[PDB]
Design a protein around this motif. Sequence first.
Motif, PDB file in Angstrom:
ATOM      1  N   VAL A   1      -0.690   2.091  -3.228  1.00 35.54           N
ATOM      2  CA  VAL A   1      -0.582   0.816  -3.928  1.00 35.54           C
ATOM      3  C   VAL A   1       0.369   0.959  -5.119  1.00 35.54           C
ATOM      4  CG1 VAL A   1      -1.817  -1.110  -4.985  1.00 35.54           C
ATOM      5  CG2 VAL A   1      -2.941   0.269  -3.204  1.00 35.54           C
TER       6      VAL A   1
ATOM      7  N   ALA B   1      -1.234  -1.157 -13.771  1.00 36.09           N
ATOM      8  CA  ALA B   1      -2.067  -0.169 -13.085  1.00 36.09           C
ATOM      9  C   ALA B   1      -2.482   0.962 -14.026  1.00 36.09           C
ATOM     10  CB  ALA B   1      -1.330   0.391 -11.873  1.00 36.09           C
TER      11      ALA B   1
ATOM     12  N   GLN C   1      -5.070  -0.295 -16.619  1.00 33.03           N
ATOM     13  CA  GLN C   1      -6.409  -0.416 -16.056  1.00 33.03           C
ATOM     14  C   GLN C   1      -7.092   0.943 -15.887  1.00 33.03           C
ATOM     15  OE1 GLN C   1      -6.641  -2.820 -12.505  1.00 33.03           O
ATOM     16  NE2 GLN C   1      -8.889  -2.752 -12.453  1.00 33.03           N
TER      17      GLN C   1
HETATM   18  O1  265 Z   1      -2.702   2.391  -8.685  1.00 28.17           O
HETATM   19  N1  265 Z   1      -2.779   0.978  -8.749  1.00 28.17           N
HETATM   20  O2  265 Z   1      -1.799   0.193  -8.108  1.00 28.17           O
HETATM   21  C1  265 Z   1      -3.765   0.406  -9.431  1.00 28.17           C
HETATM   22  C2  265 Z   1      -3.946  -0.900  -9.638  1.00 28.17           C
HETATM   23  C3  265 Z   1      -5.034  -1.185 -10.385  1.00 28.17           C
HETATM   24  C4  265 Z   1      -5.754  -0.134 -10.809  1.00 28.17           C
HETATM   25  S1  265 Z   1      -4.977   1.236 -10.211  1.00 28.17           S
END
Ligand code: 265
Length: 162
Positions: free
Chosen positions: A87, A99, A102
């Motif tokens: 992701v 990201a 968070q």
């Molecule tokens: O690694 N990511 O794309 C994340 C997105 C949201 C918390 S981790």
Amino acid sequence: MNIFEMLRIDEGLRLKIYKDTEGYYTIGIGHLLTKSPSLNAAKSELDKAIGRNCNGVITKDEAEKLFNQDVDAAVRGILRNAKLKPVYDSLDAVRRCAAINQVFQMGETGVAGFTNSLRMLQQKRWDEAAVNLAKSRWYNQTPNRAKRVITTFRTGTWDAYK
Ligand SMILES: O=[N+]([O-])c1cccs1
């Protein structure tokens, strides 16, 4: 704007041991010391992190050094996590900052329940991802910060941080 300026806004800077939003001993720019309710345990963690007897107080340079380490480690962690790496790598640089933000706040364990949000992010279904992200303890407990981070995920701009 960049990840350092973003997290500096969201976490603040305090040079004496304080309790974070969850009640945990913290210092600097959101550097969690321990989840222990014992202040002495937090002081020990601080001294270990800085490499001197701090007596619960650090300098701005020391806070910034921990911050650098913490941001670096957050990224390296994401890259070692089989659920997160695909992701993260699918994202543009601005959303990658969201990201990191968070994970910095919640930890990798904190992001464990975000499977559906993560899928929507990888699919670039930005409005849907943003709706799903807000259905969370995270959003309810820290709504103004979560709103900024979610706007960053939704738009891939720094509009929420001006
Ligand atoms: O690694 N990511 O794309 C994340 C997105 C949201 C918390 S981790």
